[PDB]
Paper text:
Gene transcription is a fundamental cellular process carried out by the multi-subunit RNA polymerase (RNAP), which is conserved from bacteria to humans (Cramer, 2002, Werner, 2008). The σ54, which controls stress related genes including those involved in nitrogen fixation, nutrient starvation, infection, and other cellular stresses, forms a class of its own (Buck et al., 2000, Merrick, 1993). σ54 recruits RNAP to its promoter sites via binding to the −12 and −24 consensus promoter sequences and forms a stable RPc that rarely spontaneously isomerizes to RPo. Instead, it requires ATPase activators bound remotely upstream of RPc to convert to RPo (Buck et al., 2000). In order to understand how transcription is initiated and how initial de novo synthesis is carried out, we prepared samples to capture the RPo and the RPitc state by binding σ54 R336A to a promoter (−35 to +28) with a pre-opened transcription bubble (mismatch between −10 and −1 by mutating the non-template [NT] strand) to form RPo and then adding UpG di-nucleotide as well as GTP, to allow de novo synthesis of a −1 UpGGG +3 RNA to form RPitc.
Where nucleotides were added to RPo, we obtained a structure at 3.7 Å of the initial de novo synthesizing complex (RPitc), which has density for the whole transcription bubble, the newly synthesized RNA, as well as dsDNA both upstream and downstream of the transcription bubble. In the RPitc, the transcription bubble has extended to 15 nt, in agreement with two additional nucleotides being added to the initiating −1+1 UpG di-nucleotide. T strand now is pushed further back into the channel and is stabilized by β R1269, K1262, and β′ R346. The T strand is in an expanded conformation compared to RPo. The β′ coiled-coil loop is now positioned in-between the T strand, RNA and σ54 RII. The downstream dsDNA is stabilized by residues from β′ switch 1 region (1325–1328), β′ clamp (residues 207–212), β′ trigger loop/helix (1145–1150), and β′ jaw domain (residues 1170–1175). We see clear density for the 4 nt RNA that base pair to the T strand. Our structure reveals that the RNA is in a post-translocation position, and the trigger loop is accordingly in an open conformation with a shorter trigger loop helix (Vassylyev et al., 2007, Wang et al., 2006). Interestingly, we observe density corresponding to σ54 RII.3 close to T strand and the newly synthesized RNA. The structure here is consistent with a role for RII.3 in stabilizing and guiding RNA toward its exit channel.
Numbering used by the authors:
A (entry chain C): 1 to 1341
B (entry chain M): 104 to 257, 259 to 291, 293 to 396, 398 to 413, 415 to 473
C (entry chain D): 253 to 503
D (entry chain D): 52 to 101
RNA sequence: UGGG
């Protein structure tokens, strides 16, 4: 335990205090999981290639009876690896093999085929592959794609907030949104009528859209309403009783029931009389006539004598109609309830809005009402109805639409057809009215349970589907006139829409951009990101208010801390450490089951809807040995709230406390002691850190750095470890142990470490061996460390000794002062790498050769150039020196003696060729690293291109011969065994070459078996390794693909060193970013009683205002951190015995209460104690978890172990006057960071640059020499001062005056200092732009 | 950070900078007429900056009214020094004379030889020295540092230039050979025209106006689409048909070339000559040789019944006169007889001009 | 502005002219042809939409390009900039001699002075440098003095010291609100890549030092130096014209 | 092209004082009409004026 | 994407 083979070198101290149930996962897995979902064979139809294949296929031409049947698919092996394909600048992809067969139906026969043709498929498209590090390599780029955040398809009931007409009326609408196709919306107007909006068109009533569903008015009222039974016959005039349906009522007359009084006139409507009359059983009783005039007939009743009828529905009656309907002979007439308390009259007004009760008519008004164009032909109405409404291809809800659709309606089935049925939208309408009736709740938009994310797999599947349908459109047309086509699955498929669709999506998009190469943490947080943008998207500006606010469902899924500030606030987010994604695309978070009074160790992942109903315990809570709670009242959360609950009322447990913080902010110790916004800045500034020469371990830390560094994929992870054989800077090999081995071929592990290589930000990356020799390796090891990594631990910055005071007022506001010692020690130094390219192209005048130095240039620049005009490796190029020369011929020379005389003295070219060359720009100084030049097939390479081929061939042969050497090593071992078995000549047997001629015949069995088998193995391994070496050599040298117009490409790399300077722009992880005002010498820095000056000094003024207590705690805990290491170092200066050092180390690690760290000495025997001591000589890596920290008692005790003053303050003396400062001073060690922002590129100071051809103004860009900008508020200010000439020179002469330039400059050279203003050209531009219009403007004399 | 469509904007190209001599004269402290005379001088400066017109033509073109040549001459010599080591003055002597005046003003054997070599006998000493070594009185290799110093003396101007217009062909039309057939596959093909029509079709139904705009927005757009997609498809089909006709009709790999009347290639597709000959003007061809769909359509009767036009003859004639003259024949008629021995029926009178043409040293190589 | 990669590039507003002239030549060629009235009415409508789309892009047909889509631009949007005067005129000009560096703060350089980087120098003052090089007789031709500046001889540093001594240089920040955001100070050459600003004046800029950049301008001629020295000197004006309570007060 | 946008003749000469079809190159010829077209000599800054 |  607690080994890992790295950790035995250096131990971290953890304060613990709470256990961790589950380990941190791979944490990139979900990303790869998406890729793992895109490529696989799924018979069930899961999202991937098979879903699009079964979606588009089978395909058939119209009335041609020809079908195509696709069967599965297959993927081939890439032509290159990651390294070589990244170096050559070629995209990294894989071939696509998807088989399909052609079937020709029989002519003029039912359900028959004359012949079927199954042949091999044609090569189409290229599908890239996601690297093990999680990047998509295209054109030599990292190209990390960010996941998308959007709303899930389904039904959304919205209250809209109820403010529309200002009259204070609530309006409940709803939106059914499918996955693809037209969106359907239902809305209420203040008129209290139902209206329908289809694809944001004009508002139409809900009756005209339902009328096309073949529901008659009687079926509409009978289906969508509950009619009360009423019958008036023989003057009785009685109705049925509705005690439960009728609550409140107004009685205008006495109501008696079965001869007994029931409700008196003006009687109380309270539940007393309702229950009194409800207890007794009363049949239908008579009522007065006045109650009928308020009722409305539901169904359509006709007289039995004659055929005519009265209207349809939604029409009241009169006292004169009772004679007609009573004389007609109708015994019973069903009428709707006509009672408004919770319910109310609806849909009646909508019936009154439109005349059309019929499918044909309503189809006409919906057709012509939608499309402004050609009126309906009665074909277009049905074609747009069936095509735009539910259909197989156009309308698909699939799993999210059907699942959320059935869940919103409380339906039992979780699946169904991909299209809506007739009763589905009717149910949406019934519940939709039920929301207005007062029953039900309004779903929130910001609620995450309805908010779904997508990944690269589903989007790439969508684009591949769009391309495959785009081809499917063209395939159907060629099958009609094709008749019999030999080898049909060959030329009938074009790969241009496929490779162009997927190559266009991966190549260019707003969700696919360059990965940040600075630090591994910026890579991890770059690969894990949430964005509301994308194809459905939320673009910007709009929809940005409530949505940006924090919602309680964001607790254990997205980190509230990390987010950019000004533009993107509330949009970009970061997932939690333990957060994962469901198969359906929903985020869940784990919990810990609690049964009875004990807490079970099993975990259960819950979603928002699942966790909302149950109760989850608070993060920090005590525990017992059996798992019982110490306190009865436990803080918990039920629904959207928090409060105390009983020990038996809590369902689950929060497990770890870090579930609410992402990986970037998980490296901030004592997060509770810093402000929320300042920690938001601290997590942002730590991602911009630039790596340096040597990474120093942080004294104050967390312990998440290990999983971040090993899971970032930057370092070298050792697989199937074993005894190390050979080590080296660029190569490390390991001999695998015999325990885990694959039978046959033997072989050992080889590792090629990545040397200095250009970045996207121009920085450098490197790897160095962490092991020496003769030590084993366990699986899951770290062989090398990438940039800003130390022994597998992630150190992205360098510690310093902080002193808090002002020093002679040199620190002002947030600024900082640095000692010269930091500059002398080389700390805070970075290296950049710049790529330079020169192209040679074939023009109209013929090819452009690169050779024969440069014309019209002295030998000064020619001495540095050779090998066809390229610089040597290791040369230092400064200034405007030409790195690569080039000659472009010009053949326009004709005749006259001046040409012959010009060619007499000089000859050769005689100035017929231009001097254009690479021409390295100024402001760049450094040496050369690598020559990347690419050449063309059959262009007769020559030059130096053969040297790199000899290097690659020598390397491939050198590292290739090792495995073979092992092959005949073991082979000669076995042959040695069989020759020693009998007739052993001892050393003489090894002295004779060629296996001593196979030891003659020896025994007969070995002569017919062992000898021929041994020679067969020798010839097989020999010729096999020679064949593989020849194929590899043929693989090294290959013609590089390039454009038909380009001839040859030259690329050379440069390196530049950058040292710390007053430009500064440093930062901490607590949100503190200063600048360097002055660099003081060591003599001027304050020193303690021992004479040790402080390295860095900060201003305390920012501590109370910015509310950062983690800084000071980091300084004191840094003192207690380094003091112990100084004790071990002081003990090692005297070469103390292993016993005393063992007692001091063991006494050092076991301190503190609890901390649940059981690591202890008296285990490692002899050495490895002195190794870890020599490792911790510099300092002790104390690790502090995020939400579990240390305390003042632990800091003071651990500090008193180092004999340091408990108050954390030490006396200091002045470095100049030497006087003692009044009051003590807090000293410490804080972790310091450098930022990519430097004054090297931020200084310009333009004098006279190039001018634009339009408006005669300078440009704005640096390098191309921008003149910055002079704005409107500046003219406002200069008008506030009242200076006419100071602004007058800047408005005209310095900008828009053509003659003011030359004449002004001429007056300045002579020293006249005369203005002589002139007329601006931009005003003339405005003049002409107005003159183009019919408006005339003219100056006056 | 891609900013959607990207800048894609007019941009106001800032390069220009053909001649800065105007900005140089603008800073020269002239009085009154010297500025106008200087502007008259700088206008006649050639792009090469070696020999510019005639000194008398300037003065005759000034509209003198006195202002004799003694002034404008001092303006010449005056600007030539402020020039980048020199400009114009022609004569081919004044360039090297001014370049050596302010360069050094000392070294071993600079001015002593430079004055006589620059003054006279230069053109006589350009080919070889020989007897001139006895005229200059120098002994053996003493002049090696002199002429060696002149070699570095060097077109006098053309230092600034700054002409980014390199004029590249790029793609255009391509052909390929394989499986025993060197047949072009029309190896361009953006497909944008094809793609745009397909893509634009989606665009027509995307107005989202509610005005329908069936009369103007819908029919006109459709017409434009038919009009541009049909025109691009017809142009691409004509270019592919002409590229295939010229491909199959003549083979580049085979030695020599076959003359094609404009009519034979026009008679293959049965199209008028002007239509195809106009298509072959600005359209080039890219194969794995050289770098035009115009030089491969050269027509000539070759003036013989036994065989090809002039391209084959011209290449052959330069391949003949290339290696020849072991001694110093310096002969064109002998090349016309050797060419006549193959049955080409060369006149041998106009043969030299053809042979001489296009950088050939003949007949001045004698 | 033809590009070598894209051959001849055409502006979005250029196609409107060839479109209106195209439909105009169609209407004129088809007019005298003596054709039915429906076709010539359709031609009048197409030309009407063409001219109306040329003058005003917004509303109406809002014609869309095939390749780049977008509404493109018409004369109404091409007036100036944003369809204001702001971008290319009315204080939209970039002038010259501007800023672009970081600001620092020393506890020296009296309140009328500011540290000017010596590398930031030698460039803004090039006209003065050439003037004094031609005045003192150390050179003759302008190109010779240009080579002397490019070779940065030690004498050029002394002459530059003579130039910068009393020559004022005015400072301004990027989001200037009140008038005190832009002032005029006396430069003093300092060794470094940044500018040292007086601390007490920083409160007038309402900024802090995180490494913020700045804007710098150099007045030319003469009267501009008198308007900078007599007005924008922070030693000349203290009381802010808002409260009347003093500013630059230490903190 | 003649009679077109930014055409020669009207709107001014394209390059320096040169004229079409190689006539009246520079300098002493100012007021004049070219043989083939109405091209005249100008500083070429008139492109904005016309 | 990022800085005030």
């Amino acid at each position: 335990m607690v080994y890992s083979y790295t950790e035995k070198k250096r131990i971290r101290k953890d304060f613990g205090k709470r256990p961790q149930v589950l380990d941190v996962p791979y944490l990139l897995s979900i990303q790869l999981d998406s890729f793992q979902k895109f490529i696989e064979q799924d018979p069930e139809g899961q999202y991937g290639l098979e879903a699009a294949f079964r979606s588009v296929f089978p395909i058939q031409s119209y009335s041609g009876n020809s079908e195509l049947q696709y069967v599965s698919y297959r993927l081939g092996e890439p032509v290159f690896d990651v390294q070589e394909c990244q170096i050559r600048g070629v995209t990294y992809s894989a071939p696509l093999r998807v088989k399909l067969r052609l079937v020709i139906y029989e002519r003029e026969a039912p359900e028959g085929t004359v012949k079927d043709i199954k042949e091999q498929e044609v090569y189409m498209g290229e599908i890239p592959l996601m690297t093990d590090n999680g990047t998509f390599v295209i054109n030599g780029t990292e190209r990390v794609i960010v996941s998308q955040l959007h709303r899930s398809p389904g039904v959304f009931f919205d209250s809209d907030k109820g403010k529309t007409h200002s009259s204070g009326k609530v309006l409940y609408n709803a939106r059914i949104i499918p996955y693809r196709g037209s969106w359907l919306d239902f809305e209420f107007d203040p008129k209290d009528n139902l209206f329908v909006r289809i694809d944001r068109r004009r508002k139409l009533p809900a009756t005209i859209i339902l009328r096309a569903l073949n529901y008659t008015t009687e079926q509409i009222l009978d289906l969508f309403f509950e009619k009360v039974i009423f019958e008036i016959r023989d003057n009785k005039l009685q109705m049925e009783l509705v005690p439960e349906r009728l609550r409140g009522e107004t009685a205008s007359f006495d109501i008696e029931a079965n001869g007994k009084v029931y409700v008196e006139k003006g009687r109380r409507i309270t539940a007393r009389h309702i229950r009194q009359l409800e207890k007794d059983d009363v049949k239908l009783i008579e009522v007065p006539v006045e109650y009928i005039a308020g009722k409305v007939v539901a169904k359509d009743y006709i007289d039995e004598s004659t055929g005519e009828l009265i209207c349809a529905a939604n029409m009241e009656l009169s006292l004169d109609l009772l004679a007609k309907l009573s004389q007609s002979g109708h015994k019973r007439i069903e009428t709707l309830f006509t009672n408004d308390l919770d319910h109310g009259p609806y849909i009646s007004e909508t019936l009154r809005v439109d005349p059309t009760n019929d499918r044909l008519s309503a189809l006409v008004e919906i057709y012509r009402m939608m499309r402004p164009g050609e009126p309906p032909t009665r074909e277009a109405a049905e074609s747009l109805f069936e095509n735009l409404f539910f259909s197989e291809d156009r309308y698909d809800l699939s799993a999210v639409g059907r699942m959320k659709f059935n869940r919103s309606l409380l339906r039992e089935e979780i699946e169904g057809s991909g299209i809506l049925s007739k009763d589905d939208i009717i149910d949406v309408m019934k519940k939709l009215i039920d929301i207005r009736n007062g029953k039900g709740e309004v779903d929130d938009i910001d609620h995450l349970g309805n908010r779904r994310i997508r990944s690269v797999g589903e989007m790439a599947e969508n684009q591949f589907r769009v391309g495959l349908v785009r081809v499917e459109r063209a395939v159907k047309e060629r099958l009609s006139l094709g008749d019999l086509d030999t080898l049909m699955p060959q030329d009938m498929i074009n790969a241009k829409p496929i490779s162009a669709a997927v190559k266009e999506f991966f190549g260019s998009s707003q969700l696919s951009q360059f990965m940040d190469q600075n630090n591994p943490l910026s890579e991890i947080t770059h690969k894990r990101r949430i964005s509301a943008l994308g194809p459905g998207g939320l673009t910007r500006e709009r929809a940005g208010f409530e949505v940006r606010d924090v919602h309680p469902t964001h607790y254990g899924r997205v980190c509230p801390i990390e987010t950019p500030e000004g533009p993107n606030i509330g949009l970009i987010n970061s997932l939690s450490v333990y957060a994962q994604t469901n198969e359906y695309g929903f985020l869940e978070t784990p919990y810990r089951k609690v049964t009875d009074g004990v807490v079970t160790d099993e975990i259960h992942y819950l979603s928002a809807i699942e966790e909302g109903n149950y109760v989850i315990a608070q993060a920090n809570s005590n525990l017992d040995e059996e798992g019982h709670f110490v306190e009865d009242l436990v803080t918990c959360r039920s629904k959207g709230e928090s409060s105390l609950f009983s020990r038996d009322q809590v369902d689950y447990m929060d497990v770890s406390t870090q579930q609410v913080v992402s990986v970037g902010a998980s490296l901030i110790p004592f997060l509770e002691h810093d402000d929320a916004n300042r920690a938001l800045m601290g997590a942002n500034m730590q991602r911009q850190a630039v790596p340096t020469l040597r990474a120093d371990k942080p004294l104050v830390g967390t312990g998440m750095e290990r999983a971040v560094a090993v899971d970032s994929g930057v370092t070298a992870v050792a697989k199937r470890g074993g005894v190390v054989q050979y080590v080296d800077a660029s190569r490390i090999v390991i001999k695998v142990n015999e325990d885990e081995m694959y039978p046959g071929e033997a072989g050992i592990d080889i590792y090629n470490l990545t040397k200095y290589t250009r970045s996207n930000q121009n920085t450098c990356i490197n790897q160095m061996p962490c092991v020496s020799l003769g030590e084993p390796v366990e699986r899951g090891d770290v062989l090398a460390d990438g940039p800003s990594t130390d022994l597998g631990e992630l150190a992205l910055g360098q510690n310093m000794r902080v002193a808090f005071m002002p020093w002679n007022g040199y620190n002002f506001e947030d600024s900082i002062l640095v000692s010269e010692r930091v500059v002398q020690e080389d700390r805070f130094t970075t290296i950049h790498i710049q790529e330079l390219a020169c192209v040679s192209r074939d023009t109209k005048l013929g090819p452009e050769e690169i050779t024969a130095d440069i014309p019209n240039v002295g030998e000064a620049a020619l001495s540095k150039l050779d090998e066809s005009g390229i610089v040597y490796i290791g040369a230092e190029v400064t200034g405007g020196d030409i790195l690569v020369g080039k000659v472009t011929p010009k053949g326009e020379t004709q005749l006259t003696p001046e040409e012959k005389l010009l060619r007499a003295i000089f000859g050769e070219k005689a100035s017929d060729v231009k001097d254009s060359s690479l021409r390295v720009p100024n402001g760049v100084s450094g040496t050369v690293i690598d020559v990347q030049v690419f050449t063309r097939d059959g262009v007769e390479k020559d030059k130096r291109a053969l040297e790199i081929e000899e290097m690659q061939l020598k390397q491939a042969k050198k590292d290739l011969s090792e495995e073979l050497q092992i092959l005949e090593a073991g082979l000669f071992s076995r042959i040695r065994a069989v020759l020693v078995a009998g007739g052993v000549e001892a050393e003489k047997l090894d002295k004779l070459p060629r296996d001593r001629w196979l030891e003659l015949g020896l025994t007969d069995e070995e002569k017919q078996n062992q000898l021929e088998q041994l020679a067969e193995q020798y010839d097989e391994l020999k010729h096999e390794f020679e064949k593989k070496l020849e194929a590899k050599r043929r693989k090294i040298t290959q013609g590089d693909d390039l454009a038909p117009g380009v001839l040859k490409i030259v690329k050379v790399y440069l390196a530049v060193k950058r040292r710390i300077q007053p430009g500064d722009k440093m930062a901490g992880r607590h949100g503190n970013k200063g600048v360097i005002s002055k660099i003081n010498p060591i003599e001027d820095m304050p020193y303690d009683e021992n004479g040790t000056p402080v390295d860095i000094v900060l201003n305390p003024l920012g501590v109370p205002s910015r509310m950062n207590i983690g800084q000071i705690l980091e300084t004191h805990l840094g003192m207690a951190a380094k003091g112990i290491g100084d004790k071990i170092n002081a003990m090692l200066k005297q070469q103390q015995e292993v016993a005393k050092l063992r007692e001091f180390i063991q006494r050092a690690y076991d301190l503190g209460a609890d901390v649940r760290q059981k690591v202890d000495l008296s285990t490692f025997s002899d050495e490895e104690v002195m190794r870890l001591a020599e490792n911790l000589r510099k300092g002790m890596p104390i690790a502090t978890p995020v939400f579990d920290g240390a305390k003042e008692a632990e800091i003071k005790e651990l500090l008193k172990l180092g004999d340091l003053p408990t108050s954390g303050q030490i006396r200091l003396y002045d470095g100049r006057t030497g006087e003692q400062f009044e009051r003590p001073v807090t000293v410490g060690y804080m972790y310091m960071l450098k930022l990519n922002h430097l004054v090297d590129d931020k200084m310009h100071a333009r004098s006279t640059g190039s001018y634009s051809l339009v408006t005669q103004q300078p440009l704005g860009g640096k390098a191309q020499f921008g003149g910055q900008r002079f704005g409107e508020m500046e003219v406002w200010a200069l008008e506030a001062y009242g200076a006419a000439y100071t602004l007058q020179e800047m408005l005209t002469v310095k900008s828009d005056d053509v003659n003011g330039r030359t004449k002004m400059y001429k007056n300045i050279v002579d020293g006249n200092h005369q203005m002589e203003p002139g007329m601006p050209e931009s005003f003339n531009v405005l003049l002409k732009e107005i003159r183009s219009l019919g408006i005339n403007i003219e100056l006056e004399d | 950070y891609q900013d959607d469509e990207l800048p894609v904007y007019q941009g106001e190209t800032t390069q220009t900078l053909q001649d800065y001599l105007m900005w140089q004269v603008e800073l020269t402290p002239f009085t009154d007429t010297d500025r106008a005379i200087a502007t008259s001088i700088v206008d006649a400066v050639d792009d090469t900056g070696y020999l510019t017109i005639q000194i008398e033509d300037i003065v005759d073109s000034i509209g003198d009214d006195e202002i004799g040549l003694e002034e404008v001459e001092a303006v010449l010599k005056r600007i030539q020094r402020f020039d980048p080591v020199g400009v114009a003055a022609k004569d081919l002597r004044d360039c090297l004379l001014i370049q050596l005046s302010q360069f050094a003003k000392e070294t071993p054997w600079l001015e002593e030889a430079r004055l006589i070599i620059s003054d006279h006998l230069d053109l006589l000493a350009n080919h070889d020295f020989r007897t001139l070594m006895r005229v200059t009185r120098l002994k053996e290799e003493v002049l090696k540092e002199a002429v060696n110093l002149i070699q570095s003396l060097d077109x006098x101007x053309x230092x600034x230039x700054x002409x980014x217009x390199x004029x590249x062909x790029x793609x255009x039309x391509x052909x390929x050979x394989x499986x025993x057939x060197x047949x072009x596959x029309x190896x361009s093909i953006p497909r944008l025209k094809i793609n745009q029509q397909y893509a634009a079709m989606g665009n027509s139904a995307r107005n989202d106006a509610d005005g329908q705009f069936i009369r103007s927005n819908l029919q006109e757009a459709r017409w434009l689409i038919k009009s541009l997609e049909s025109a691009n498809d017809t142009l691409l089909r004509v270019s592919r048909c002409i590229v295939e006709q010229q491909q199959a009709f003549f083979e580049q790999g085979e030695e020599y070339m076959k003359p094609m009347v404009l009519a034979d290639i026009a008679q293959a597709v049965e199209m008028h000559e002007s239509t195809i000959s106009r298509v072959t003007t600005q359209k080039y061809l890219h194969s794995p040789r050289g770098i035009x769909x115009x030089x491969x359509x050269x027509x000539x009767x070759x003036x013989x019944x036994x065989x090809a036009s002039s391209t084959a003859i011209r290449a052959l004639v330069k391949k003949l006169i290339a290696a020849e003259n072991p001694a110093k024949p310096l002969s064109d008629s002998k090349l016309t007889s050797m060419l006549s021995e193959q049955g080409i029926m060369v006149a041998r009178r106009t043969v030299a001009k053809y042979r001489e043409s296009l950088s050939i040293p003949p007949s001045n190589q004698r | 502005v033809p590009l070598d990669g894209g051959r001849f590039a055409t502006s979005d507003l250029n196609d409107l002219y060839r479109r209106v002239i195209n439909r105009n030549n169609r209407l004129k060629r088809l007019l005298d042809l003596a054709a039915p009235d429906i076709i010539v009415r359709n031609e009048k409508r197409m030309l009407q939409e063409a001219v109306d789309a040329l003058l005003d892009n917004g509303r109406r047909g809002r014609a869309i390009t095939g390749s780049n889509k977008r509404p493109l631009k018409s004369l109404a949007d091409m007036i100036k900039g944003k369809q204001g005067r702001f971008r290319q005129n009315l204080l939209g000009k970039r002038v010259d001699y501007s800023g672009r560096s970081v600001i620092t703060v020393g506890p020296y350089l009296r309140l009328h002075q500011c540290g000017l980087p010596k590398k930031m120098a030698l460039e803004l003052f090039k006209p003065f440098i050439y003037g004094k090089l031609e005045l003192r007789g150390l050179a003759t031709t302008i190109k010779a003095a240009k080579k002397m500046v490019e070779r940065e001889e030690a004498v050029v540093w002394d002459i530059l010291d003579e130039v910068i001594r009393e020559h004022p240089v005015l400072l301004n920040r990027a989001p200037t609100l009140h008038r005190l955001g832009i002032q005029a100070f006396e430069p003093v050459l300092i060794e470094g890549k940044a500018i040292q600003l007086h601390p007490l004046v920083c409160a007038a800029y309402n900024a802090d030092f995180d490494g913020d950049q700045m804007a710098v301008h150099v007045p030319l001629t003469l009267e501009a130096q008198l308007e900078a020295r007599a007005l924008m000197m922070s030693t000349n004006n203290i009381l802010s014209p808002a409260n009347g309570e003093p500013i630059i007060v230490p903190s | 092209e003649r009679d077109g946008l930014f055409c020669a003749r009207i709107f001014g000469p394209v390059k320096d004082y040169e004229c079409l079809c190689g006539k009246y190159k520079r300098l002493k010829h100012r007021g004049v009409i070219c043989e083939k077209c109405g091209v005249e000599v100008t500083q070429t800054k008139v492109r904005r004026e016309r």
